[PDB]
Every structure is written in structure tokens, then in C-alpha cells.
From a paper:
However, few X-ray structures described the binding mode of multimodal compounds targeting MAO B (covalently) or AChE (reversibly), whereas to our knowledge this is the first study reporting the binding poses of two dual reversible coumarin-based AChE-MAO B inhibitors (1 and 2)20,21 on the crystal structures of both enzymes.
Among previously reported micromolar or sub-micromolar coumarin-bearing dual inhibitors, compound 1 returned a tight-binding inhibition of MAO B (Ki = 4.5 μM) and a +5.5 °C increase in the enzyme Tm value. Indeed, a linear increase of IC50 values was observed indicating that 1 is a competitive tight-binding inhibitor of MAO B. An analogous experiment carried out with (±)-2 revealed that IC50 values are not significantly influenced by enzyme concentration, suggesting that this compound is a purely competitive inhibitor (data not shown). Therefore, all ligands had a stabilizing effect by increasing the enzyme Tm but 1 determined a remarkable +5.5 °C shift, which was in agreement with its tight-binding inhibition mechanism. In the structure of MAO B in complex with 1, the hydroxymethyl substituent at C4 lies between the Tyr398-Tyr435 pair forming the “aromatic sandwich” found in other flavin-dependent amine oxidases. The bis-N-benzylamine moiety is wedged into a pocket of the entrance cavity adopting a hook conformation that was never observed in other MAO B structures. Phe103 and Trp119, which belong to the surface loop giving access to the enzyme cavity, are displaced by the terminal aromatic ring of 1, and, in turn, the side chains of His115 and Leu164 adopt a different conformation. As a result, the shape of the cavity, whose plasticity has been so far limited to the open/closed switch of Ile199 leading to the bipartite architecture of the MAO B active site, is in this case conserved in proximity of the flavin but significantly transformed nearby the protein surface. In MAO B, the coumarin moiety and the linker of 1 are forced to stay longitudinal by the rigid enzyme cavity and the terminal aromatic ring is accommodated in a niche of the entrance cavity rather than protruding out of the protein surface as observed with (+)-2. This unusual binding is allowed by conformational changes of the residues in the rear of the cavity (His115, Trp119, Phe103).
Residue numbers in the entry:
A (entry chain B): 3 to 496
B (entry chain A): 3 to 501
Write the structure that this text describes.
Amino acid sequence: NKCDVVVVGGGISGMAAAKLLHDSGLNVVVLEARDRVGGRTYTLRNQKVKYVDLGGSYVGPTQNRILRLAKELGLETYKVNEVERLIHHVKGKSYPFRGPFPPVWNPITYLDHNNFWRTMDDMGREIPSDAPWKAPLAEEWDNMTMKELLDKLCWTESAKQLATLFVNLCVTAETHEVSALWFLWYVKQCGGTTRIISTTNGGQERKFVGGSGQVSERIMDLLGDRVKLERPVIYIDQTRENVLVETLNHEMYEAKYVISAIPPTLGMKIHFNPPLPMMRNQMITRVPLGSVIKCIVYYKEPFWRKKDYCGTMIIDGEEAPVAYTLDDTKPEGNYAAIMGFILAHKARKLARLTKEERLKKLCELYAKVLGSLEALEPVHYEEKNWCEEQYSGGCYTTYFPPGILTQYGRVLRQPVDRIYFAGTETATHWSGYMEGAVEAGERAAREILHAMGKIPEDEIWQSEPESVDVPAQPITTTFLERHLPSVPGLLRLI
Amino acid sequence: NKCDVVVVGGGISGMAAAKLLHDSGLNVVVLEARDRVGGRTYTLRNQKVKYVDLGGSYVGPTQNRILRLAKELGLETYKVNEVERLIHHVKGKSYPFRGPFPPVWNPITYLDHNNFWRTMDDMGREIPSDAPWKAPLAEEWDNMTMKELLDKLCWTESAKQLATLFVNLCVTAETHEVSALWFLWYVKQCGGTTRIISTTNGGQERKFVGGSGQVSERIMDLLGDRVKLERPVIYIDQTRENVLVETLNHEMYEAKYVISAIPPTLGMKIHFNPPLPMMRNQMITRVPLGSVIKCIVYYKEPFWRKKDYCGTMIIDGEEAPVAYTLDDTKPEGNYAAIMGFILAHKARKLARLTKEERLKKLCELYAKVLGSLEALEPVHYEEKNWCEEQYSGGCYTTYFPPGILTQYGRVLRQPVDRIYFAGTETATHWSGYMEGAVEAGERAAREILHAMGKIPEDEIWQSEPESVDVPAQPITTTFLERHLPSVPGLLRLIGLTTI
Ligand SMILES: *Cc1cc2c(cc1C)nc1c(=O)[nH]c(=O)nc-1n2C[C@H](O)[C@H](O)[C@H](O)COP(=O)(O)OP(=O)(O)OC[C@H]1O[C@@H](n2cnc3c(N)ncnc32)[C@H](O)[C@@H]1O
Ligand SMILES: *Cc1cc2c(cc1C)nc1c(=O)[nH]c(=O)nc-1n2C[C@H](O)[C@H](O)[C@H](O)COP(=O)(O)OP(=O)(O)OC[C@H]1O[C@@H](n2cnc3c(N)ncnc32)[C@H](O)[C@@H]1O
Ligand SMILES: CN(Cc1ccccc1)Cc1ccc(COc2ccc3c(CO)cc(=O)oc3c2)cc1
Ligand SMILES: CN(Cc1ccccc1)Cc1ccc(COc2ccc3c(CO)cc(=O)oc3c2)cc1
């Protein structure tokens, strides 16, 4: 019935918001559509896997809010295995390498590849994190897909395939589907190409012991009966003195304020009175989520480490179901496993198959990439197709098609009367990640503390001290990386 | 509570479906979200306008189903005024012309222009109406925006600017927003470039006496109390023997089948049990509608006719609020009016102005374009911003961004258990129009008649006799239009001849 704030959605963002309001002395209710909390994080437990992250999993340096929240809740991290060599599989062959991205040996291709990622970072430096529509070339860049940008920029097929794989892996969408402006903002607001792609010293450095689902679960433990499971919100009425929020199971919640902590497009599942203003009414029809099946094959031992492979595979080409993998073995060396993503159009394609059919295809691919018959002998398999989730819409995050971010992007976090907007999509650092979810939940919470007169405006956005446990090292470039010419640049000099 | 078929949506599609099902003996209920039927058609009546269409309005040759439905309901059509000259306004100057598109005198530009719409129609013939994703180059065309297609095809800026305006007018979206495959399909399934753009012998030839809103209102008259206004559907449960459909005002309806006759993305407003299959689940987050404000400025007299202007203006330029107008004078010659569209990014930009400020900007534009100070003397104004409609999502219709139609297109009208899909977006001919609404509504109803064993499979898709009142002149080309080279084709002829 009555409270101070109703939070819609019990993902990390909603939970982080609810925890902050609760800790400040307000009465909060969290309305969650599903029979669980965690949303796009989900940790499955059984005896075969012990625990496995089937959704969001990795955290790394510069993600200081999720690390502080998780540490307070009593969680600890361990490092993803990256002691041995990475593998780039291209044109049916495996090339082992060390470092964040595969070395290029052909000198023309080297120039072209080097220029491409240098250029993504250069372009990013002109895009404000909190307002990408204010980039000097915002409209130009927003009216191009990433496919067009890559066709203009890449002179070699081989750099273009690498760059395409990069886009597919970062945002689980095809290059032709996404705005260039949006994608370039996305990379930049994670701290750039190196930081976004890297395990060591990057976004995939670490996992939580026991799974990331414990973040949402432990906050639920704190809030007790204030969290209502299987309460999908259908109706929010703001015509009266207090805000009225109705659920599908026929309950009514009354509050001074609401935090919407759901993906923007899932706003469509709610009937509003009065209707939303025009820009938000259209925006929420224009912002899909990507497509991904997360797949984990278990083995008796981490047999790849014997061949001096870490388990990371970057896999080129149309025929491979999986483009990217990481070692998902536990810290102790047991429950050996490879984690792989079936991305974008391959997710639509292979979802038709049975679970056993997908396992066979993955095992045969890994046998080829890792060069071991051991890969043909899985002891267990887990997978989740996030495309089929009614209350997520896909994974990892919301992508913006061409034209949308400049026309509608301004309204993402704009309050609608007494509704404030959270969700990772509204963050300005690591938006799309669990880190963004924390930033956005806590920021929306503090917007409401400010509307209530409890805090000054300058405390709505709060900086975060660096994690002592997971410090950031500088991102560096070499002299040659910075000043080698592009392919057209070399041509002009001839 | 109990019936044979619940129809969700009381637009033309829903009402056509419900009418067919009722006439064949079944017990139907229509659940409509709004306090009125008609959806994206809406006829306003007051003493200043008598009546005016603020949404869907025009019908034309080849739209035989809406013409038949309208005629059986006791409606009549009249011709939109195209007696005098059209105007093309570009770079601040007005160029009167006759015929469907502004003729191009600069020969190079002529070749480029000619080639552009010829290539639109050529590519269109590659694309099956009922399965655009089966075109031989479906993938390549779908992975491209219309902006990229026009940048490759137009060797002159003037052709490119005309092509851009064509896309904005047809689908109320920017060239960079829409899939090339989708747009080429959309045009082809309307009968091609000429048919879609034309007043005489095209989509905009006629209007209903009294407004298009009467189609929905008259079917509601025939169905009586079976139509339920202010029943937004929130929940559809298919787990039991009978389908359960729940509304926001707390009513439960129980049926054998459901027709969903709402724009695909407004399917998001419904919670499904069991959950939708993956492909539909994602598809309905990927298919927005366009952006338009429809504006009608009333004048003492249709003063433009006296200058030998019919009232049609094709207006190119960033400063121009309105890109296209038609004469909206009553057939009796009174309530003189100009109907205009504010399209795509201009809808967004100008929505933040007041009604009075928008009227002012339109008048100043019309005055310049028509060369007439009388345009600054309006007697009345009406407008409707469709972008602000919770239960439409925009107008005229749904567009597909790059990559969506090939990946998700095949599930648009794929039934989900005992839910069948209508709405104009699921039609194969004049999808996006009132015609497509009628086609899709009647087809979905007949899918259900087949499921119930009342008709054979070959009667689901039914052809439509040609209107005797609105006969279709065929679309013809001249020899020169068919065989004149493109710009790069001419350049090839030049390089070859000089060797
Ligand atoms: C799915 C996924 C995500 C993911 C990733 C891999 C996959 C396969 N890998 C990641 C990673 O390694 N590291 C990382 O930091 N993030 C990763 N991601 C993304 C990450 O999981 C997400 O950014 C994050 O979990 C998003 O959190 P947020 O709190 O913003 O959103 P959410 O989890 O979707 O929660 C929304 C909740 O709202 C409920 N809901 C939806 N509709 C309603 C209604 N109408 N009423 C009530 N509740 C509603 C949802 O059920 C959900 O719980
Ligand atoms: C908006 C517009 C449309 C239009 C046009 C100009 C404008 C500004 N010009 C046209 C023209 O000149 N000639 C023509 O043939 N078409 C033109 N268009 C398009 C035309 O209006 C539409 O194609 C057509 O009206 C679509 O009919 P359909 O029946 O397919 O779709 P609808 O009208 O949107 O009806 C949907 C109904 O469903 C209700 N609804 C929505 N959600 C719910 C829920 N959850 N529960 C119950 N009911 C729901 C809507 O309220 C609506 O009545
Ligand atoms: C193909 N690419 C080329 C390249 C790109 C940029 C700069 C230099 C070279 C190398 C590369 C290496 C590793 C990656 C991995 O990137 C990600 C990005 C986001 C995630 C996420 C998102 O949360 C989850 C995850 O499990 O793994 C990820 C992995 C991408 C691209
Ligand atoms: C700019 N263009 C150039 C061109 C386009 C194609 C072939 C040759 C030249 C000419 C032109 C002229 C008129 C039009 C008008 O097109 C439409 C399309 C759909 C509608 C619709 C859709 O319902 C409603 C309406 O009131 O007006 C429309 C008007 C478009 C294009």
C-alpha cells in the first residue's frame, strides 16, 4: 500500500537505488515482475557447476561503484585466467598471441588495423560521456551505421573483419544495426578500446566468488519483505496527490515518487496516466536490446592450459557459432569450463536448435580452435538465451539504431513528473554494465532525496574512490601506435 | 465475459475482422483502448470545419477492399482537387508544374532523376510482396539505410534531394532511419513509385464524404454493444483451454481465439502467458512508427485556385516546417483549407512550439510558396500530433530499421498458438494504409474460420473485385523513361566511344 518510493525493477540498478533510499530512512518498496531478483544477472546453482553466471558476470578496474557495493555486501572477486596465450582463429587456423588484441603481421594490414582503433579513440575524445548528442559531429555520426564507418575507414578486409568482431562482441548487435555515434560513445564511456576489450587491466579482469546474482540477492536480504516478487507493473497514475502504481496481480502501491529501473523499451509494458510526453512515448519504441546466448561447456580438467592456452578464443567467420570465449574454471582449478557467446544474427539462427545440438557444434568448434580431442568430451552444459526473456528484451544492453540517440537521447534520464529513471542505460560510465546499473540507481535515488529537500543539487552526482583491491593501471600506447600513418596516409606520401 | 473471438483494437483492421466474423455467425467482442473507434483514422466534427480527417484520409485506385467496405457501409468518395498546377518549392523558389512529379530540365539531372525512380521500381520487382526477405539480395539491401542507397544511386544533389523528400513523405521517417530493403518493399507493395506518389490515379485521389472515421463508427453501429471502449488490454493468457484476455479496468474476457489488430510494437503493452516466442519477443522492440503532425489551415476562400494552383505543394528545405500539402476544401467548394504534414525530424523540432506559433510559421511558408499575402489570413486551424498517442505510437505506420526485416520479418503475421495478427502492418498490398487494414483484418478473421473448420485453406487469402466507381488506370512508362542511360551508364558510353 503506502510508502515514500516505489522502485520498478529489482535488477542491480533498482536494488542499488532501494538500498540507498532505505539507508537514508525512507520506506521503499521494490516491485519485481519475475519470481527472482537480478534481472540480466542470473547465477544458477547445481552440484555439476556449483554456481555459474548465465548473465552479467565480469567486473574490472575503473568499475569502482559495483566493487564497493559488492564488498560492503561481503563479496570477493577472483581473476579470470589469462596466464597463458590467447588464440585468434582466422581462416580455419589458430594463431596464439599475448596481449589484448591479436598481432597483425602483414605491414599494410598492420597500418590499417592500428589506424582503426586509434581512430575510434580519437573520435571518442570529442563525445561527452553525459551528453553524446553534444558531440561536434553528432548528427553526421548518428546518421551512419557502424557498418558505414568501417567501410569508410578500413582499407583491408582483414581489419574490417576484426573491427566487426569487436562491435559484435561489445554490443551483441550487427555493425549495420547500430549508430556510429552511439557505438563510439559506448566505447569511450567505458574508458576506450583497450579498457573495454581487455581481461587483464580491463572490463573482463574479474568475477565474483559465488556469482554476481548475489549482489541483487543480498540487497533483497537487507530489504526483507519490502521486495515484491511476481509483481509486474502494468499501470502508473500520476493525476492525483500521490503516485499510484498497479501490478498485474491486482495490487496497488501509493508513493510520493517512483524509480523506473527497467530497460527503456520495457517502459512500453506500462500504461501511463497521464500519457507520457511525446519524446519519451516514441523513444521507448526505438531502443532494442541485442541478442546473445551465453553458453558454458564443462570439462574434467582445464586441458587448454597444458598447451599454454588461457582459454580465450577470438574466432572469425560465419561458420563458427561462437566468436568469443573465456576460461570459466573456478579459482581452485576445478569445475573446468569454457564460456562462449553466440552473438547477434547467430543467436537468431541457432536458437532453433535443441540444447544437445548447440553443445555438439560448440564442442566441435572448440576442438578445432584449441586443437584437442579433449574438447569433444564435455561433462556438462549450461546456456541461457536472453532473447526469449519478456522482462529483459535481450542482452547485454540497449543499442541505438541510426538517427535515434541525437533525436531522443536527451530524454533517457529526464524525470517525468514524479518518475525518475534508473537502469544501466542511463549511466554515464560503464553504461550497459553492472557498474552502470549501480551508478544510475544511486544517482536516481539521490535525485529523489534532492526533490525531497534532503540533499543539495551538487550531491546528486557523486564521485567514487578507487577500489584498493582492484586498482586501475594506466592505458598506454607506443610511439609507433600513435604516429604510424593510415593506409590513405601512406598513399598520400607516395 | 465469454465469446468465440476477442478482437484487440477497434481501428479499421479490428473492425473489419470483427465484422466479417459477426456476418459469418460467430460471437465477437472488440476491446478498444480509447473512448472511440478508428485508431489512426480520426474525424473531428465542429461548426468551424464541419468535419475533418486528422489521421488516415485518402483512398485511391487499386484499394478495392476499403472501397468495397466503405461502399457497403453507405459511404461515398469525392476527388481531391488537382485541376490546377502543382508547386515544387526548392531553394526558396516556386516552380509550378503538371503531372505526378516536378519535371527536370537540366539533361544530366534528368538522367539521374529518371534513373533513380526507375531503379526503385526495378529493385522492387525483385522483392516478393508476401516475403520481402526472399529477394535474392535481401541481406545486402536490408544491411543498408535508404540514405546509403541514395548516396550510391544519385550522381546529382538535385535528384538526391527529391529522393530524400520522397522517402520522408511516404514513411514519415529520415532516409538514415529506414532499411533500403524495407522501403523498396513498401513502395512495391503499393504498386510502385507512380502509384504511391500520385493524386490523380494514385493513393491520394479521393476522400470519404463525411470523413474516414465513419468506417469504424458504422461497423460499431452494426456490432452494437459488442464493442467495448476504454478497455486497454494488459494481459493475454493462453495456458488453459480457453484464452483469457484481461483489460486495465479489471474485466476478463474468455474466447477460443484472439486477433491482435494493433501496431506490432504496441504488443509490448500486453503481458503474455506463456511468454512470446523469442523472435516475436524481440521483433516488437525493433519496429517503431514514424513521426508526423497533420495540420489544416482554413481560409475564407480557396484563393490559390484563382492563381491556377491546385493547392499541392512539394516543399524542399530545412527552414520549411511543412514538406507536403494538399487542397482540403470540401467538395461543395466551402471550408477552404490547406492540409499539410510536419514530417520526421521536423515533427520533433516543432512539437515544442504552441499551436499559435505553428499556425504562424505555416502561414508564412504558404504565403511565400503560393506568392500570396492572403495565406497570412487564416480563419481557423486544426492539428494532431500522432507522436504523442500512447495507443498509436506514431503515424502513418511502422518502419523497419536496417537489419530487422530479414531477421524478424517472417514472424509479423505468424500466429502464436491461438493469437492471430491483423493491422495494416501485416498486409501484402497497401500495408501502411486503410486498404491494408481491411486486407489484414479480413485475412486474420478467415485464418480463424479455417482453424475452426468453417472454410478451406484456399479461402484464407481472397482476391478483391475491382471497384466499378474507382477504376484503376495502369501505370505506364515512355520509351525514353525505360531506355535512357544512368549517369554512370552515360560515362561508360563516353569512355568506350573514346577508345
Ligand atoms: C544478459 C547479459 C548481461 C551482461 C553480460 C552478459 C549477458 C549474457 N555480461 C556482463 C558482464 O560480464 N559484466 C557486466 O558488468 N555486465 C554484463 N551484462 C550486462 C549487465 O548484466 C547489465 O548491465 C545489468 O545487469 C543491468 O542491470 P539493471 O538493473 O539496469 O537492469 P536489469 O538487470 O534488466 O533489471 C531490470 C529488472 O526489471 C524487471 N522488470 C522489467 N519489467 C518490469 C515491470 N513491468 N514491472 C516490474 N519489474 C520489471 C526485470 O524483471 C528485471 O529484474
Ligand atoms: C496517422 C495517419 C495515418 C494515415 C495517414 C495520415 C496520418 C496522419 N494518411 C493516410 C491516408 O491518407 N490514407 C490511408 O489509407 N492511410 C493513411 N494513414 C494510415 C492509416 O490511418 C492506418 O494505416 C490505418 O488506420 C491503420 O488501421 P489499423 O486498424 O491497422 O491500426 P489502428 O488504426 O492503429 O487501430 C489500432 C487500434 O487498437 C487500439 N489499441 C492499441 N493498443 C491497445 C490495447 N493494448 N488494447 C486495446 N486496444 C488497443 C488503438 O486505440 C486503435 O483503435
Ligand atoms: C577483435 N578485437 C580487435 C581490436 C579492437 C579494438 C582495439 C584493438 C583491437 C580484439 C578484441 C579482443 C577482445 C574483445 C573482448 O571484448 C569484450 C567486450 C565486452 C564484453 C562483455 C560485456 O559485458 C562481456 C564479456 O563477457 O566479454 C566481453 C568482451 C573484443 C575485441
Ligand atoms: C518528391 N517526389 C519525387 C519523385 C518520387 C518518386 C518518383 C519520381 C519522383 C515526388 C513526390 C510527389 C508527391 C509525393 C506524395 O507522396 C505521398 C505518399 C504517401 C502519402 C500518404 C500516405 O498515407 C498520405 C498523404 O496524405 O500523402 C501522401 C503523399 C511524394 C513524392
